[PDB]
Amino acid sequence: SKTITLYLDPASLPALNQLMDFTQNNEDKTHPRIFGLSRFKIPDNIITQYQNIHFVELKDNRPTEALFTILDQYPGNIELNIHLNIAHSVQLIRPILAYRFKHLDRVSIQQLNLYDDGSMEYVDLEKEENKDISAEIKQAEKQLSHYLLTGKIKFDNPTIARYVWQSAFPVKYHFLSTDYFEKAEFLQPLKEYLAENYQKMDWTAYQQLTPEQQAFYLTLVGFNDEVKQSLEVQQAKFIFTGTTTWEGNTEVREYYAQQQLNLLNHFTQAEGDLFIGDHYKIYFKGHPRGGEINDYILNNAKNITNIPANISFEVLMMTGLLPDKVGGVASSLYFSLPKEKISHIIFTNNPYVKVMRRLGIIDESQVIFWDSLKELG
Numbered sequence: 001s002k003t004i005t006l007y008l009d010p011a012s013l014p015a016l017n018q019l020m021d022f023t024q025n026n027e028d029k030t031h032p033r034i035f036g037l038s039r040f041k042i043p044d045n046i047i048t049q050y051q052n053i054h055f056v057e058l059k060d061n062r063p064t065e066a067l068f069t070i071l072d073q074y075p076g077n078i079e080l081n082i083h084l085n086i087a088h089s090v091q092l093i094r095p096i097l098a099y100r101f102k103h104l105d106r107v108s109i110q111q112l113n114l115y116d117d118g119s120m121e122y123v124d125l126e127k128e129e130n131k132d133i134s135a136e137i138k139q140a141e142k143q144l145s146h147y148l149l150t151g152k153i154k155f156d157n158p159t160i161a162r163y164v165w166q167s168a169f170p171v172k173y174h175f176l177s178t179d180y181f182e183k184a185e186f187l188q189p190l191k192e193y194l195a196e197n198y199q200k201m202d203w204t205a206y207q208q209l210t211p212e213q214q215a216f217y218l219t220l221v222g223f224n225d226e227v228k229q230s231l232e233v234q235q236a237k238f239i240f241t242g243t244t245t246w247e248g249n250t251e252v253r254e255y256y257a258q259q260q261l262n263l264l265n266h267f268t269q270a271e272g273d274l275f276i277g278d279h280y281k282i283y284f285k286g287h288p289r290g291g292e293i294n295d296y297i298l299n300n301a302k303n304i305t306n307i308p309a310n311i312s313f314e315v316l317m318m319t320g321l322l323p324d325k326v327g328g329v330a331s332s333l334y335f336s337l338p339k340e341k342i343s344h345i346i347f348t349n350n351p352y353v354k355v356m357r358r359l360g361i362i363d364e365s366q367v368i369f370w371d372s373l374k375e376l377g
C-alpha cells in the first residue's frame, strides 16, 4: 500500500495529541499527511521541511471537498490512518467515507485514533445515566453499519455512537479521563465493550521527546520564549482561566464577559469571596475562542499578564511552567491539572458538576455558580 495519515480536529485537545503524534514521527519527511486543525497553524519553516504535506479546511465539523483533490494525487492502493475528535467523529469521517465509496477498489481505512474533544464527551455520557447501555451500544452498531453501507447518518443515540467504531475498524481511543469510565458504574457495559481499545492521554509524552523535538513541538503549539520568560519570574503565580460561549447573542456574550471580570475580582480583590491573598503575580489565560470576552478582561483589569489565548493551558504543564495556583470557570484544562494547583473552579442536577464530582476534581460541598457572586465595586 501507500499509507496516508489524516489529522483532523476542530478543537484543541485532539490537535495537541495529533501534533504530538506528528512530532514523534517527524524524522519521516515524505510520509503523506493531511492536516485539518482549525486552531493550529503549522509554521511555514516547518512545512518546507516536508514533502507530501497537505492542509484542508473544516466547515461544519467536516473537511471540505478540497480533501478529494488532495487524495486524487495518490493513485495506487491507499490506506488511511485517520486521527479524529471523538465527539465529532461521525461528521469528520463523512467526506472520507464518501471518497472511499467512489474509490472502493483502491481506498481502505487502515485504522482510527480518536481523542476527546474535552469535557463535552463526559457531560454527554453523564446524560445517559438511566439508559440500557448494552442495548444502546447494539443499536448504535447497527446504525453505524447503515452509515458505512449507505453513507447516510441516522443515530438514535449520537452519544453512544461515538464509541462503537470498533465494530467496523481497528481503533484506539485516547481519553482525557479513564477514571470516568472506570468509576461511573452505569458505564460498566461500555467500559467492558471497549475492552482493550482505549488508553489515557499521555501528558508525559513531551518529556520523552528529544530536546530538538520539544522545541519543534513548542513551535507547533505557539509557545514562544517571551511567554516562557513571563512565566519564569521568582514570584508566586496565579493564572485566571477564561471561558467562552458559542452563543452569538450580544446580550449573552456581554453577560459572560461581565460575569467573568467580576469572578476575577473575587479572586484578586481583598474583599472577594475567593481572595487568594497578596503576593501572587496574576496572569490571564483566555479561552482560545473567547474573542471579545478575552479582550474585556485585558481592557478592564489591572496588573495582569496575558498568556496568548491560542496557547493551550496544558503546554505549561509540559514545559514545567505551571503556576502555584489556578482558578476560574470550569473547563477541560482542570481535568489534567495537578490537584494541588486548584484554587477554585466556578460554574456558569448539572451534568458538568456531576462529572467533576465523580472524578474528585471538586468535593462534596456546594458548588459556586458565578451568578451567586456579588458585583464588586
Ligand SMILES: CC(=O)N[C@@H]1[C@@H](O)[C@@H](F)[C@@](OP(=O)(O)OC[C@H]2O[C@@H](n3ccc(N)nc3=O)[C@H](O)[C@@H]2O)(C(=O)O)O[C@H]1[C@H](O)[C@H](O)CO
Binding pocket: 011, 012, 013, 117, 118, 119, 120, 121, 123, 241, 242, 243, 244, 245, 246, 285, 286, 287, 288, 289, 309, 311, 312, 313, 314, 330, 331, 332, 333
Ligand atoms: C461541555 C462542552 O461543551 N465542552 C466543550 C469541550 O468539549 C471543548 F469543545 C471545549 O473545551 P474547553 O473546556 O473550553 O477548553 C478545552 C481546551 O482549550 C484550552 N483552553 C481552554 C481554556 C482556557 N481558558 N485556556 C485553554 O488553553 C485547553 O487546551 C483545554 O483543554 C473547546 O472549545 O475546545 O469547549 C467546551 C465548552 O463548549 C466551552 O468551554 C463552554 O462553552
